[PDB]
Design a protein around this ligand. Sequence first.
Ligand code: BCL
Ligand code: BCL
Ligand code: BCL
Ligand code: BCL
Ligand SMILES: CC[C@H]1c2cc3[nH]c4c(c3C)C(=O)[C@H](C(=O)OC)c4c3nc(cc4[nH]c(cc(n2)[C@@H]1C)c(C(C)=O)c4C)[C@@H](C)[C@@H]3CCC(=O)OC/C=C(/C)CCC[C@H](C)CCC[C@H](C)CCCC(C)C
Ligand SMILES: CC[C@H]1c2cc3[nH]c4c(c3C)C(=O)[C@H](C(=O)OC)c4c3nc(cc4[nH]c(cc(n2)[C@@H]1C)c(C(C)=O)c4C)[C@@H](C)[C@@H]3CCC(=O)OC/C=C(/C)CCC[C@H](C)CCC[C@H](C)CCCC(C)C
Ligand SMILES: COC(C)(C)C/C=C/C(C)=C/C=C/C(C)=C/C=C/C(C)=C/C=C\C=C(C)\C=C\C=C(C)\C=C\C=C(C)\C=C\CC(C)(C)OC
Ligand SMILES: [Fe+3]
Ligand SMILES: [Mg+2]
Lengths: 46, 46, 46, 46, 46, 46, 46, 48, 47, 274, 45, 45, 318, 278
Amino acid sequence: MWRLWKLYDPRRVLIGIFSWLAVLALVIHFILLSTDRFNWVGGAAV
Amino acid sequence: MWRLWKLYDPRRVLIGIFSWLAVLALVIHFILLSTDRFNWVGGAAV
Amino acid sequence: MWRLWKLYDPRRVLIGIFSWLAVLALVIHFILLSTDRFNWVGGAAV
Amino acid sequence: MWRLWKLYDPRRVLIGIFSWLAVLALVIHFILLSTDRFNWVGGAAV
Amino acid sequence: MWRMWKILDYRRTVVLAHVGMAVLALLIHFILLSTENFNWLQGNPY
Amino acid sequence: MWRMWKILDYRRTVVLAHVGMAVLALLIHFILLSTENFNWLQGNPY
Amino acid sequence: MWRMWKILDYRRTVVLAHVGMAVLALLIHFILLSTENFNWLQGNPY
Amino acid sequence: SLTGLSDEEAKEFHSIFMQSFLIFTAVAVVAHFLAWAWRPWIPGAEGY
Amino acid sequence: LTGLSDEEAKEFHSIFMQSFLIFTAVAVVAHFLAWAWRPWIPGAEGY
Amino acid sequence: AMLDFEKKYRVRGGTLLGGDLFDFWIGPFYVGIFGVLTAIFAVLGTVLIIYGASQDTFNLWQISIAPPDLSYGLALAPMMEGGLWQIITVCALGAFITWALRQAEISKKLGMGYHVPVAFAVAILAYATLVVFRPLLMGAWGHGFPYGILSHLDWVSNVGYQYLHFHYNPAHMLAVTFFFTTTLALALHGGLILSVTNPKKGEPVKTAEHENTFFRDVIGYSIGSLGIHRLGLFLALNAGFWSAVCIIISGPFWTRGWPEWWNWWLNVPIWSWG
Amino acid sequence: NVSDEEAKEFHAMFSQAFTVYIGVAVVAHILAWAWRPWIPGDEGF
Amino acid sequence: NVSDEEAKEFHAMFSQAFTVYIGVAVVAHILAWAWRPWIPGDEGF
Amino acid sequence: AEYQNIFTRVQVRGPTDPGVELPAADWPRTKGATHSWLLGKIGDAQVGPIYLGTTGVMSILFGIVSIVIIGMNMLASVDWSPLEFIRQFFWVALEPPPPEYGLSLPPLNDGGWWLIAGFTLTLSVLLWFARTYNRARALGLGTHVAWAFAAAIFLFLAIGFIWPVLMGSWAKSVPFGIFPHLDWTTAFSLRYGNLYYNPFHMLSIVFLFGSALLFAMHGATILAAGRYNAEREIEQITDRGTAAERSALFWRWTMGFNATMESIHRWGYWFAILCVITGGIGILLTGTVVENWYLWGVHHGIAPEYPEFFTPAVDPAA
Amino acid sequence: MEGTGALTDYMNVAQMTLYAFWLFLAGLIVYLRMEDKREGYPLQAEANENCNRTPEKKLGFPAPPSPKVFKLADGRSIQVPRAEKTDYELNTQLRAEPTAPWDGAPLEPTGNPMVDGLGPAAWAKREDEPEVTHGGKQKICPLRVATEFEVGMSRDVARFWPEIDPDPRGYQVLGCDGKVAGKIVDIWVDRGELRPMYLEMDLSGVGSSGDRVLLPINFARVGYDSKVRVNAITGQQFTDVPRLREADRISPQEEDFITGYFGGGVLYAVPGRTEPFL
Ligand code: BCL
Ligand code: BCL
Ligand code: BCL
Ligand code: BCL
Ligand SMILES: CC[C@H]1c2cc3[nH]c4c(c3C)C(=O)[C@H](C(=O)OC)c4c3nc(cc4[nH]c(cc(n2)[C@@H]1C)c(C(C)=O)c4C)[C@@H](C)[C@@H]3CCC(=O)OC/C=C(/C)CCC[C@H](C)CCC[C@H](C)CCCC(C)C
Ligand SMILES: CC[C@H]1c2cc3[nH]c4c(c3C)C(=O)[C@H](C(=O)OC)c4c3nc(cc4[nH]c(cc(n2)[C@@H]1C)c(C(C)=O)c4C)[C@@H](C)[C@@H]3CCC(=O)OC/C=C(/C)CCC[C@H](C)CCC[C@H](C)CCCC(C)C
Ligand SMILES: COC(C)(C)C/C=C/C(C)=C/C=C/C(C)=C/C=C/C(C)=C/C=C\C=C(C)\C=C\C=C(C)\C=C\C=C(C)\C=C\CC(C)(C)OC
Ligand SMILES: [Fe+3]
Ligand SMILES: [Mg+2]
């Protein structure tokens, strides 16, 4: 599996992964904010 | 009048005349189909 | 009429003929569908 | 003031002036027509 | 009148005739389909 | 008036005359068809 | 005032004068036609 | 001649052209006589 | 003229007609079945 | 008469049909077989339009050849009840298709690519969308637009308002953007070429290095002399293509108000915020 | 340019067609007037 | 450039095709007229 | 199977181009220029450098203030919610003053922010015109691009500034928003009776459609003649090659007439600016000298008359 | 009709403003049409086109404007339309014969139209001095003399995904019939547009390995299989592609010679290309 880094550029993999993490974390955090139950700053009641 | 063909190519006048006759025949047949009196397939009465 | 093939490429004639049949067959089939009598899949009753 | 004609082409200036005079004369004539008092063809009464 | 094939290329005319006749035949068949008395598919009383 | 053809090319004038008269002849025939008293196909009372 | 033709090209001016006067004459005739007191075709009371 | 046709070929084309025009016009005249016999296309003072 | 000898053109004109005949033969049969199902030429009274 | 360099180009061949029979020029026009066809279709359609004008009015703006009623469906209508429109429509389609096929022959005769006929086919596709594809999908030829200078403007108005706000059509938004962008690109390209070849009086004609430098100075990017013609064709053809898309989805694929189509955006779970 | 003979030859060709065309046009207009005159009076047609 | 012999040969093929096409068209029109005449009378069909 | 000249296959990268040297009074260009493979497929691959002068920088400052004012008002309109800002992105706007204020200065939250945003945006485009004008002069080019831009500004100023001033109220001007300014476009046509009947709107469409038509023709012609190096249009203008000859002959044989390599750009230039010039004039005419464009069309005999299809409605209050 | 904008009982401001633009537009169309006539005018009306049987010059409407003067950077002034380009066109004797004597009949080439310059093979009369950039360098030049240029816009793309960033040096050249004409030995680049203009290739497949010839990049299909396919001409016809006067420079006239030759193959490369589908 370490042969991946001879085949793939580590920088473009990490930039690709970090971009995916940045977008995914933002989308999930935003999705929770849109829901009444999981909007932590809205302070809704279960 | 035979000297007209020393000025105009026979082929180009034949195309010109046949195109004019084709267009003219279609227009008149179509114009007759528009009028009720001469719409033979329409079969209007006099 | 065998001399007709000395004047035309047989491949191009077949392409033209076959393309004409394809358009003709589709139009006639779709015309019959539009009719309230020959629409076979529509369950028309005479 | 005659030195002006060495700075600018006499033909170019005259065309510019004549076009300016033509457009201005049309505008003023139509401005008068728009007004009720100065419309000569309309025959208004003051 | 074999002389007509000196002025006009015969094999080029044959292709033109077939394409042209196809359009005319389709046009007339479609005209009859639009008519009440000659729509053989609809079969209105004569 | 044969001196006209030393000034105007006879060959191009004839073509210009035929096309121009074709438009005019069609135009006048269509003008009559627009009227009530001169549409021979409609045959309105005169 | 014949020095006007050393500054202005006479041949160009005459053509432009005819076109320009055609435009002006058509405009003024049409202005009179749009009025009620000077439309000679309609013949309104003056 | 700016067509290539000689005088005799210009006359030959004219003879067939005039003959073809006359035969075309003759069929047209027969067609119009049959058309007129069916329904005349010139209205009277009171119309059709 | 397109490159084709008399032998080849005559050979093509035999397969072409047989292909045309077979195509038309099936089409005629298909029209026999279609007519037996519902005729498409109406009478004076219609359908 | 011919251009002083035209003689060496007027050669034989390159036709798709007709060949030597129609391969000639009448004045500047190349004829070909499709030129005869496009002339026959054009005159026939125009004369039929003029006849339709004679039966209604000769006012140039008020001439209108209207399609049949929706009650006729896909059937051919009587001549004075939309049948004339149907005949002119097939004549116009024939005229347009033969026009592009004629350009293909001219392209081949000059050794040029077929970009012009293909780009024109996009316009033909848009027209065929209006009078064939959309009427077919909706099931009646009466959905086509009437053949009139001012009457077809009323058709565009009413069809646009059938969806209560046509500005909210997503494909229409994209197509308008391409239309606005291509005339911006045309003004830039037309101006840039003129600016280089017609510089401030006295200065010499500038080079391609000035062209790249100018637009990199203004906006920081220059697309090049080849890129701009690719971009111009791209923007114009997408304007044509997305115009066809916006009208083809109006009624066959969307029957409600176009603003309501954006309700999917308003209900995205990421940014519902409620 | 063209010679006097060629100009006269063209005009002879032109005069043949002009006479026939104007002759048919004149006859056509006489028939047309005999059918329905196109100049209305003060009360119309 | 086309010679008389091949022009006659082209006309020979054209004449054969034309008469076969004419024959079917004439027969088709006879059948169509027998089915329904397309020339209306004073009162129609 | 032929190269369609749609994407560049083989690319060559030299050193980044500093550009034609400017007179020793302009600001230095930026030092950041790169090459993009993706942009080299379509055209020139170099991105940057960009010139930042006095007018360029000032235009950005006015433009940023305009965008900040518009953006902050948009964000405040959705209660500072970035989620609601994304959700309502096409619907939010900076609204013009209500009609009660006329042409006077309205309060900030009642059209004042709109007027400030409109003023600074106008200044930025005016300074950008001067920036485009100066860049052409600095390189010794003609100012055709600047004057084409000035024609665009004329419609921008006619729609947003000149026509509202003629009408006597800022309320008639257009809001800074995506869907709201489409609503203004439609409400403009509804208010003044079907802007389809405005002749200058018709003409503006002629040149808008004619611009796309011309660029489709010219873009395809140059790409079709790209075999003969047609895209090198400057050389083809000063030294007519076979590409210019074939391009001219292609359209002459097609439609009887043709342009030159230089003259087709004049056609495209004037079609683009006439679209925007006639558009501006038509907007100035409506409301000022024409109330209802349809009734004006009826007055001039251009409105078609339709036969009866339904029972016409009668106004109950008539 | 009352209200603001009224000019008469019928005329109003919006109507007169429209007619003002019609006058401006008509004048503009005349100006644009005159700009269209600065190349190729006056028209040459050959003898068969007129009843007077003598060549004539036709202006058309609107008539062509006065000649335009271009100031060039090197220090020259060229008047458009150029005298020598027109003089060359009206003095050369085409190796083609019209199929019919009347005007508008197409020309039938007598010799080899690809090398004689008929139709798609035609070339324009252009200057024989190779172009230079604004700096002063040679404008179009091969990579060997222009060492600042490397093949491939992105090193990473050309290295790891070379299919979409190809380096066609060393590839094989295939004609329209699959004949292997030769091998690309160099790429010519334009210093003004930074693009490959030509692919220099030896004729090893159909001639000598030392004979160099230029293949225009727009006539070359650079595939993904280390092949360059030329649908324009036959592989054997590469031997007649016009040669450079100088081995390292190409002039605008030479560019027309080369692109003209390959363009001649659109109609004349193989028998049947000049014939219709049916
Ligand atoms: C209520 C009205 C609605 C609206 C309703 C519609 C409707 C309905 C339609 C559009 C369509 C369009 N709208 Mg909208 N639209 C509105 C407002 C706008 C605004 C604006 C500023 O507000 C703009 C810029 C547009 C722009 C557009 C374009 C995206 C598109 C028109 C271009 C096109 O169709 O190309 C296509 C080009 C053609 C079809 C031309 C065809 C060319 C043919 C093949 C060649 C003809 C040759 C000719 C006969 C030759 C003549 C003879 C010679 C001259 C001698 N709309 C308003 C909000 N809009 C149209 C569309 O996209 O459909 C495709 C359409 O149908
Ligand atoms: C026998 C071989 C040929 C033939 C050989 C010749 C020869 C030889 C000659 C003619 C000439 C003529 N032929 Mg011929 N002609 C033939 C058979 C016919 C037939 C027929 C049905 O049989 C007809 C109707 C005609 C008709 C004509 C006329 C066009 C013309 C004679 C009138 C004239 O002198 O015009 C003169 C009038 C003008 C020149 C005015 C030009 C009109 C311009 C174009 C302005 C019109 C504008 C228009 C109204 C615009 C429309 C409105 C739009 C809305 C804008 N010919 C056959 C096919 N014919 C003669 C000719 O053409 O001379 C000039 C001539 O010499
Ligand atoms: C096995 C051999 C080949 C074959 C070998 C030949 C040979 C050889 C010949 C023909 C010819 C013909 N063949 Mg064949 N043909 C075959 C089998 C057929 C079949 C069949 C179903 O079996 C049919 C129906 C036909 C039909 C035809 C006709 C097109 C033509 C004979 C009439 C004629 O003289 O045209 C002449 C009539 C015209 C030229 C009139 C042209 C009409 C113009 C073009 C009208 C166009 C305007 C248009 C309608 C406008 C539309 C506007 C609308 C509003 C849209 N062939 C097979 C496929 N055929 C002959 C021919 O075409 O010679 C010219 C000929 O020599
Ligand atoms: C229901 C809608 C109405 C309609 C209502 C209007 C109204 C209102 C107008 C138009 C206008 C136009 N209409 Mg309309 N229009 C209709 C239907 C159509 C149809 C169609 C097929 O149906 C079409 C093709 C058109 C097309 C057109 C154009 C001809 C014209 C716009 C030209 C333009 O490019 O402006 C776009 C270009 C500009 C506005 C100039 C841009 C230049 C400025 C400087 C850009 C600055 C950018 C800035 C710095 C960016 C940063 C800013 C910040 C980020 C905020 N309309 C129907 C009838 N239409 C306009 C016109 O000219 O009227 C005659 C106009 O005002
Ligand atoms: C798709 C991108 C754009 C585009 C591209 C484009 N157009 C093109 C081309 C290209 C690449 C050509 O090569 C071709 C050309 O040769 O241009 C000079 C053309 C062309 N685009 C034209 C027009 C045109 N293009 C338009 C639009 C566009 N063209 C797009 C915006 C429009 C619009 C939007 O309205 C018009 C009117 C022509 C100038 C020309 C094609 C001309 C042609 O085919 O003429 C044939 C001969 C005739 C006289 C036509 C007769 C047709 C019928 C028999 C009668 C009329 C029927 C019609 C339905 C009437 C409608 C009237 C009402 C709508 C008022
Ligand atoms: C002939 C009329 C057509 C036309 C022409 C036209 N437009 C033009 C031009 C021309 C000739 C130009 O020369 C000019 C231009 O620059 O073109 C490239 C322009 C232009 N047309 C534009 C837009 C435009 N044109 C339009 C329309 C049209 N343009 C017509 C169709 C439209 C429409 C349809 O609405 C728009 C939106 C601009 C792209 C440009 C004018 C640019 C301008 O005015 O700039 C100043 C304005 C601002 C708002 C300033 C913006 C500042 C930035 C937001 C700064 C960003 C922050 C920071 C500095 C970035 C770096 C970040 C750091 C973190 C590093
Ligand atoms: C919170 O956001 C941040 C800060 C993070 C950044 C985000 C910014 C965003 C998202 C900005 C979004 C902007 C958008 C979407 C803008 C949309 C703009 C559109 C579509 C505009 C369209 C048309 C608008 C027009 C035509 C406006 C014209 C207005 C004019 C011409 C105004 C002129 C006003 C003048 C000249 C004022 C003069 C003032 C005087 C002194 C004369 O008054 C007394
Ligand atoms: Fe260009
Ligand atoms: Mg709003």
